[PDB]
Design a protein around this nucleic acid. Sequence first.
RNA 1: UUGAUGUCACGGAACCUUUGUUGUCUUCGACAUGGGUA
RNA 2: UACCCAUGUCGAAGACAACAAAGUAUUU
Length: 305
Amino acid sequence: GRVTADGKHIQKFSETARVPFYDKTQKHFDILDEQEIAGEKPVRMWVKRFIKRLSLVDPAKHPQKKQDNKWKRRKEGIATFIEQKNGSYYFNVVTNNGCTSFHLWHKPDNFDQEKLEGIQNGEKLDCWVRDSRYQKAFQEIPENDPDGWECKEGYLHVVGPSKVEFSDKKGDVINNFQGTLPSVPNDWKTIRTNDFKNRKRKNEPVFCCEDDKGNYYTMAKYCETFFFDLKENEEYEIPEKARIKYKELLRVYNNNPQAVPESVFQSRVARENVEKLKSGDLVYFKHNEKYVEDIVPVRISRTVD
RNA sequence: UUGAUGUCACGGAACCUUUGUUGUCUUCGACAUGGGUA
RNA sequence: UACCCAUGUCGAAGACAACAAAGUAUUU
C-alpha cells in the first residue's frame, strides 16, 4: 500500500514483483534517478509472472524424476535450433496454440535427445513445455530472455541490503569464500554480491566481507520490491491506534542493542532514523472493510499489541 | 515643590501557624534481523 | 501464488508519581 497525499488514508496495490538490485546482472542503481529509488516518483518496469521450461523427450516416458507432478500440466510444440554456447542450446519454439512462439536457452538433460550431442544448425524437434512462477521485474528486458514481458507502471520499494548474518567467528560460507574478503563499504548503494550459497545451481547470491575489528558479514538479500497496479478506488482510513502502534514499532527498531554494528546493513527505517508515517510512504498493510489495522515497513517485520 | 501663632508618626516588630515528606528488594535469559526458491 | 526458513548475538533501567504555597475568630 501507499499512504495518500492527505496522510489519512492508504491505497492498495494489486501486485508485487522482485527487482534484482545487488546482483551483477543489471544496472538499476546506475540508471534510476534518486527520487525513483526513494519511492516517490512512479516508474515503468517490464514484468514476467511465469517462465517457460522445455523437455525434448516426453515426460511421461522420461526416466527418473519427470513422471512427476510438475509435468502433469504438459504442453506440446516444435522447436528449431539456432545457436549453441557453453553447452547451452538456443531454440525458437512453436506451441500447439496455433501460432504462439518464443525464444529460450536450454541446458540439456542427459536424456534430452542424447544430451543434444551431434545436433546441427537449422534442425528442429518435437518438444514439451511448461511454465512456472517467476514473478520478477526489470527496467530493460534482459538478453537471453527476450519474450513474454509485460509493461507495467508502479513504485519501487527500496529498503536496502538489510538481510545480514554476522559473527565473530568464521562459518561455512566464509570458510569457503576462496579469496581475500572485502572491507565493509561506506555507501549502501555500491554493494554487490560476490558468491553463492548454492554454487552448483547458482541460487542464493551473498556478499561476504570483513571489518577492521574482526567481524564477518554475509548479506543474503539481492532483490528489491516493485509495487504496481495501484487501485484508485480503494482507500482505507488510518485510525489513531494504527499510528501509535507504528510509532512504537519505529521506536523499537531504533533502540536495539543487538542491531548489526554496521549501519549500511540496516533497513531504511533504522538506518535513517525514521519517526513517523509520512505522505507517499510505501508499506505493507492489514485492513478490515473500512480501516487500516496493522502497518509494517518490511516483508518480515514486527507485530505490535 | 511648603506657608507660617499649633505636626508626640523615634505614635505602630510584617508579626502569627506549617516535619522536604509519602511510595520503590541494585535487581536479572531468550531474543535480534528480512528474505529466499519455484 | 504457493513453499521454505536462515544466522548467532546482546546488556537494560539511572529516577518516576504527588504536593509548588495556604491560612490568619470581634462576639448574646
